[PDB]
RNA sequence: GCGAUAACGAACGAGACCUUAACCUACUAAAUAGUGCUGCUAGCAUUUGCUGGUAUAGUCACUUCUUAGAGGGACUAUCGAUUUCAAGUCGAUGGAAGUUUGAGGCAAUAACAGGUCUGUGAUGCCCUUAGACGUUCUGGGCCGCACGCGCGCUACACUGACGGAGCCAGCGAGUAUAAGCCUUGGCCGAGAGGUCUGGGAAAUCUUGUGAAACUCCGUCGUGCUGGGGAUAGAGCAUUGUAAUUGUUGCUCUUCAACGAGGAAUUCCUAGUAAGCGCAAGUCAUCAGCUUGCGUUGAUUACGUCCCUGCCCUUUGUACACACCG
């Protein structure tokens, strides 16, 4: 247990702090001489949800169409996993969950 | 209901097919049929042997539509 | 009009 | 340079493989053969009856060919087509599972095809060799 | 003559085209007399095609269509009565076996018979109705050279489809009957019927 | 006896609907008598049409 | 390696990725000869960009295209498109430009769409109908 | 393969099982005519009598005609499948069956009154003349 | 979890604050129009470039009534809305 | 059409009447230029202020102009 | 907007703005995307070639195709015409894009007795509150059929029906001790459907959703015909406690009006209309419905106020609860 290939997904909603927290592993992982590869774009998935306009049944037929944009990404690492878990605290952001598969 | 179209080829028909036909600038199933009076069917076993037989010459090929012309 | 008439 | 199934039209690489299939008489042909229809969504039972289901293995012969490890099932959607629902719209539906799942037998005791490894029907390692072969025999005219 | 090979055989009969485009390899473009002087501008012959299809942008601008190759404005009104719309592949192959139809026949050019067709069918004059909100008031009035050509086309492809429908003579070869008949000018034509009636009540409005 | 006439000038829209153009013809050969006519089309200037008759003007329409 | 570019054409949806590297002239649709395209009165639409030219001009270079996506006509002129391309982008880093710009004037004199994308996409549907522009129809 | 002649073989007007018969339809189309005989059980018991259906009805000689109408009514007997059938699990005797042309309305009559006399819904609408398989009334067939 | 209770900065431009606000003064029984300006001037006072106070219902009068009270500058359409 | 608006318009003469010296007939070199004069909230509305000061400027050079 | 100007200079709305589609061989990377090479490997002619499989250690190379973030790119750019030489408009050239680049989202000042208390543990008041008008259980009804009307689906055939064969998208969705999701692959079954394993909480698997129109080759041959598939008889499965008033699907049989539709009237200008299917929503089951998506893909204007509706100006008014005066 010591040097692993190791995966970091992250998943939010709002690209911003995404991509801080995605450059900020690998800014962390670039003056430290450790191997990566990515940030990996995940294809966006629009989860889209259209309802009735009218909370009655009168009126023209109009509808919303609401959106919820969930954008993925996927880091590949090679360090100890006492390094990456590490990492992940020091780019803690409240909007990025993040989940660690060996 | 006036068409009653012959779909049995006798030999009155059959020989005065093979006096007609190569007298003809264009012949096709519609041709065979408007002016020989032998219903679809027979007119395309007709045309796909007066072909094999060298008195018709094949234009263009095609399921839907054959066209052929005098070999004279 | 209406009213609840009962039977048993 | 060689020749390949890719090298010769489809549509009458088939009618020439289908003619051979018929002719060397060792393909199995199922008893129901003349009396079943190919897809639920058919009205009608095919109209070369002595030879669709020569026809049918040799187009799912050529099919496979081309692929990797396509199931039975994928098979009924591929030939499957519109259905004639009377006053509702049209939509597809899946061919007859026991004809192409016939097929695939008929095809895997005949020597050109056998169940490959993680799904599907791979092609035998004979299976390209006597395919190749038959389009070398459709292309000469 | 020069016969090349490619490691991808081509035929021979197909290479027999870095000569001329000739339509369907049988139509040259070369020998073909739009016979009238003021609708030169207004049928395409000068750039010649292949096939009558080419998925062209001759809707976005106004007169963009005077651009559009006149068989691929001919195949274009064929694909019509709502059964119809969107195939053209179908109509392609009436236009193709049309003018086979139209080659044996007379033994012309079968794109030169369609020229002859087309100015041959076209109204000159029409009455337009300029009615003050319900009267009757019917005026004489003259046709752009443009509306000339397009309602040729649109009478000639109408005229053959009547004549196909519930007829065992296919639509490729009514179409060859039609654009035969209007080509030569013969009254038994329809679209020759429509052109001579339109310019006759222009007549009996001046 | 048709006569062709080169339209030079395009003058506007009339009619009740839009439907008819004034147009200034110029004839093809004998280049002069120039006159206004009314055509039912899609005009651009520089289009040849001809005349069924020729010795008639044209003025705004209804 | 060798003298291989690498190019794609599009349509509607469908893209063919064409493989023009060097040789003796081999060309193949997802493996297949041209002259077994599948829409046989629209075959000539990819026979154009041959007979422009001239077959001299792919002696020494042979294509191999895939194409995936759109639909059966949208296929072929992204076909047609991949491979003219393919020619004018050999040419322009193993071959003289004077050549490339000759090439590049006979496609463009004879169609746009030989080397430049339609740009036409579907237009959204809109409520209210069941198209993008058509609607409903109404009744009083 | 190729056009033939005939004379006096071809048999204008055919009778099968008490209906007439146009002797020029296509065998597998002509025998349709018959009621209680379709497109789908045309086609088999052609195939079972070994006619070729590339043959017009008078083309038929009486050999065959015969070998059709014994098909027809011995189904079960030329490996034609139970569920192929007309009339399968019969209501009285529980066989598999295949009602013919003056049969059927006879048992698809008996089977009207089977529904009356116990007096079912299915059976009750039936007599009405109204539809009984759930269809909507309101708004649908009001032609007389 | 853990929960903190923080002071909001700018009580002015919460509008969420002042319509809580509104409406405990508005049960005390104080008149409208003393109710209204008080948040007209609240919110301005506290920076915020425009403010409008819509209220509607019933009020003695069997009759619904609205009414809307604008103060500077306010914007209305697009994606600015949304920010600002 | 492409009639533009009272925000582009007035904005692109004040341009002018501040920066014409350092202006040209060439919009390229006036759109880099306006990045640096102004504060535009969006890339669209920078080439269109420049695009239409380009259109005075190349008017300017013809006579005089109103309102500059 | 130009311009005219007792007005000048402004604000909201419009426009700007935001989302999406179309370009980038110019950056950033990608074993959940793709490719060439390379290992290993198959078939066909042997010329070293042409088609493949395999490849999560070849511990390869690359980002064009695929994905998405930072940017770049179009502003009517240049040139011709017209114009008060102004705002602008029409043509070309270049361009991925020159109709606001295509399409949408948001959207002012006031207002309607417009529609909903049948969306709300949103509500004032009135009614009821134990034989309830609360709530629950059983069964029926909301489908009920002499009729009038509206949104639609099939069709009236040959530019077609079948029968084989060819065989291409995009938008999306998907589960656990549940109360059961998407389901390939194999095996039975004519079908509908059944069964055994496995993958997938998902760019990984279903899935390239191998969709339908479509195309090729055949049968049919103007015939109420092989168009059309109501109505009905008999039978086979699925879901569900429960299918009778057939949930739906499948098999055989019956095979009706309809032979292009009067007076009227609707929608629509470019990837648009029209066909053609597919997905998501409702959903244990049922899509002839909507919301989207893509395949094939036109005719005809690019004009006008003649009809119709709305807006502005002038005008009349005994109306202002505003002609429902
Ligand atoms: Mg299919
Ligand atoms: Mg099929
Ligand atoms: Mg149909
Ligand atoms: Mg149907
Ligand atoms: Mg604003
Ligand atoms: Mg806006
Ligand atoms: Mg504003
Ligand atoms: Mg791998
Ligand atoms: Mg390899
Ligand atoms: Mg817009
Ligand atoms: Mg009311
Ligand atoms: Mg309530
Ligand atoms: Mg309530
Ligand atoms: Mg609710
Ligand atoms: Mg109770
Ligand atoms: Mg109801
Ligand atoms: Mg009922
Ligand atoms: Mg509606
Ligand atoms: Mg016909
Ligand atoms: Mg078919
Ligand atoms: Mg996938
Ligand atoms: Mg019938
Ligand atoms: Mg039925
Ligand atoms: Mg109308
Ligand atoms: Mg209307
Ligand atoms: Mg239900
Ligand atoms: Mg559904
Ligand atoms: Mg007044």
């Not at chain 5, 694909?79 to 080659?103: D, T």
């Not at chain 5, 339109?198 to 009996?204: D, G, I, P």
């Not at chain 8, 005939?6 to 099968?16: D, K, N, P, V």
Request: a positive charge; proline letters at 3%.
């Amino acid at each position: 247990q010591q040097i692993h290939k190791i995966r970091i997904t992250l998943t939010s909603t709002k690209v911003k702090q995404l991509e801080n927290v995605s450059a900020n592993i690998i800014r962390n992982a670039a003056q430290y001489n450790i191997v990566k590869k990515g940030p990996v774009r995940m294809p966006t998935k629009v989860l889209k949800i259209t309802t009735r306009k009218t909370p009655n049944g009168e009126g023209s037929k109009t509808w919303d169409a609401y959106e919820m944009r969930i954008h993925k990404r996927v880091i590949d690492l090679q360090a100890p996993a006492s390094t990456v878990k590490r990492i992940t605290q020091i780019t803690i952001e409240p909007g990025v969950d993040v989940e660690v598969t060996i | 209901d006036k068409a009653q179209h012959i779909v049995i080829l006798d030999q009155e028909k059959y020989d005065r097919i093979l006096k007609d036909v190569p007298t003809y600038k264009y012949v096709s199933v519609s041709v065979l049929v408007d002016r020989l009076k032998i219903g679809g069917s027979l007119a395309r076993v007709a045309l796909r042997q007066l072909e094999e037989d060298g008195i018709i010459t094949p234009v263009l090929k095609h399921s839907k539509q054959a066209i052929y012309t005098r070999a004279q | 009009r209406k009213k609840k008439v009962y039977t048993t | 340079p060689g020749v390949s199934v890719r090298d010769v039209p489809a549509q009458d690489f088939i009618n020439a493989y289908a003619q051979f299939l018929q002719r060397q008489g060792k393909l199995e042909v199922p008893g129901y053969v003349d009396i079943v229809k190919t897809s639920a969504g058919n009205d009608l039972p095919p109209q070369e009856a002595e030879t669709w289901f020569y026809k049918r293995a040799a187009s799912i012969a050529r099919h496979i060919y081309l692929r990797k490890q396509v199931g039975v099932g994928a098979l009924n959607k591929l030939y499957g087509g519109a259905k004639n629902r009377g006053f509702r719209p049209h939509k597809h539906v899946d061919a007859s599972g026991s004809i192409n799942r016939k097929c695939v037998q008929a095809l895997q005791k005949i020597g050109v095809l056998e169940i490959s490894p993680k799904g599907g029907r791979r092609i035998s390692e004979n299976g390209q060799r006597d395919l190749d072969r038959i389009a070398a025999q459709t292309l000469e005219e | 003559l020069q016969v090349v090979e490619l490691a991808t055989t081509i035929p021979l009969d197909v290479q027999e085209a870095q000569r001329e485009v000739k339509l369907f390899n049988k139509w040259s473009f070369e020998d073909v007399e739009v016979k009238d002087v003021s609708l030169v501008d207004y049928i395409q012959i000068r750039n010649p095609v292949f096939v009558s299809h080419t998925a062209g942008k001759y809707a976005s601008k106004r007169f963009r269509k005077a651009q559009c190759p006149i068989v691929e404005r001919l195949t274009n009104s064929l694909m019509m009565n709502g059964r119809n719309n969107g195939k053209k592949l179908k109509a392609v192959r009436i236009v193709k076996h049309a003018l086979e139809i139209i080659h044996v026949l007379t033994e012309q050019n079968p794109i030169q018979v369609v020229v002859d067709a087309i100015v041959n069918s076209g109204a000159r004059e029409d009455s337009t109705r300029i009615g003050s909100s319900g009267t009757v008031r019917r005026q004489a009035v003259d046709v752009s050279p443009l509306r000339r050509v397009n309602q040729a086309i649109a009478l000639l492809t109408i005229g053959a489809r009547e004549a196909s429908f519930r007829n065992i003579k296919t639509i490729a070869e009514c179409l060859a009957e039609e654009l035969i008949n209007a080509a030569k000018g013969s009254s038994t034509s329809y679209a020759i019927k429509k052109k001579d009636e339109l310019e006759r009540v222009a007549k009996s409005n001046r | 006896p048709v006569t062709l006439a080169k339209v030079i000038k395009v003058l506007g829209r009339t009619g009740s609907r839009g439907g008819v153009t004034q147009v200034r013809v110029e004839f093809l050969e004998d280049a002069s008598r120039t006159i206004v006519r009314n055509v039912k089309g899609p005009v651009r200037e520089n289009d040849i049409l001809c005349l069924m008759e020729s010795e008639r003007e044209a003025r705004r329409l209804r | 390696s060798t003298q291989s570019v690498q190019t794609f054409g599009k349509k509607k949806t469908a893209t063919a990725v064409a493989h023009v590297k060097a040789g003796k002239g081999l060309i193949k649709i997802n493996g297949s000869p041209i002259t077994l395209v599948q829409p046989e009165i629209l075959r000539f639409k990819v026979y154009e960009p041959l007979t422009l030219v001239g077959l001299d001009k792919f002696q020494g270079i042979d294509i191999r295209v895939k194409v995936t996506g759109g639909g059966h006509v949208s296929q072929v002129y992204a076909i047609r498109q991949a491979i003219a391309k393919g020619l004018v982008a050999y040419h322009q880093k193993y071959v003289d430009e004077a050549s490339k710009n000759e090439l590049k004037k006979i496609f463009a004199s004879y169609d746009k769409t030989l080397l430049v994308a339609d740009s036409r996409r579907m237009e959204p549907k809109k409520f209210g109908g069941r198209g993008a522009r058509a609607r409903f129809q109404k009744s009083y | 393969p190729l056009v033939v002649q005939e004379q006096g073989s071809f048999q204008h007007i055919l009778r099968l099982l008490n209906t007439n018969i146009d002797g020029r339809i296509k065998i597998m189309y002509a025998l349709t005519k018959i009621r209680g005989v379709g497109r789908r059980y045309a086609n088999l018991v052609c195939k079972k009598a070994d006619v070729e259906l590339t043959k017009r009805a008078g083309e038929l000689t009486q050999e065959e005609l015969e070998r059709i109408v014994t098909i027809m009514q011995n189904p079960t007997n030329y490996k034609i499948p139970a569920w192929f059938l007309n009339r399968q699990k019969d209501q009285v005797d529980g066989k598999d069956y295949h009602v013919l042309a003056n049969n059927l309305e006879s048992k698809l009559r008996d089977d009207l009154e089977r529904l009356k006399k116990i007096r079912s819904h299915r059976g009750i609408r039936h007599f009405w003349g109204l539809k009984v398989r759930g269809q909507h009334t309101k708004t649908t067939s009001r032609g007389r | 979890i853990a929960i903190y209770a923080e002071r909001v900065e700018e009580r002015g431009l919460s509008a969420a604050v002042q319509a809580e606000a509104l409406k405990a003064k508005l049960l005390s029984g104080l008149p409208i129009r003393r109710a209204a300006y008080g948040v007209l001037r609240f919110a301005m006072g506290a920076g915020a470039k425009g403010v409008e106070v819509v209220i509607s219902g019933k009020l003695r009068a069997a009759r619904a009534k609205s009414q809307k009270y604008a103060d500077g500058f306010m914007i209305h359409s697009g994606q600015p809305t949304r920010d600002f | 059409g492409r009639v533009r608006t009272k925000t582009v318009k007035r904005a692109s003469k004040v341009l002018i009447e501040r920066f014409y010296p350092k202006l040209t007939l060439d919009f390229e070199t006036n759109k880099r230029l306006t990045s640096e004069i102004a504060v535009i909230q969006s890339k669209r509305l920078r080439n269109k202020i420049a695009g239409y000061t380009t259109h005075l400027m190349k008017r300017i050079q013809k006579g005089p102009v109103r309102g500059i």
